[PDB]
Symmetry: none
């Protein structure tokens, strides 16, 4: 069982946002 | 260390939304 | 050290509604 | 005991919209 970090630098600019964009964190410190 | 972390960095640019993006991070701390 | 580290350094600059990107990022440390 | 580290840099400017990029990469420290 360890320590856990998510840390995401997501600058996403669509000019016309008819967007298709899937984003998941699965992030476990072992419950 | 006994730890897990996710240092993703992304500058994304697109004009028109019809483009396809998918992201599935997973990180799991067990040492 | 002990367990598991990732990085990404992303510059995606495609204007046209068309690009296909799929990312699937996993960092194990397990029992 | 066991520890792994992955990295990349990703640089895509496509003129005429075209690119497919599936990018699935593990890392597998301990087991």
């Amino acid at each position: 069982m360890g320590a856990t970090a998510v840390s995401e630098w997501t600058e996403y600019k669509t000019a016309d946002g008819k967007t298709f964009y899937y984003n998941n964190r699965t992030l476990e410190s072992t419950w």
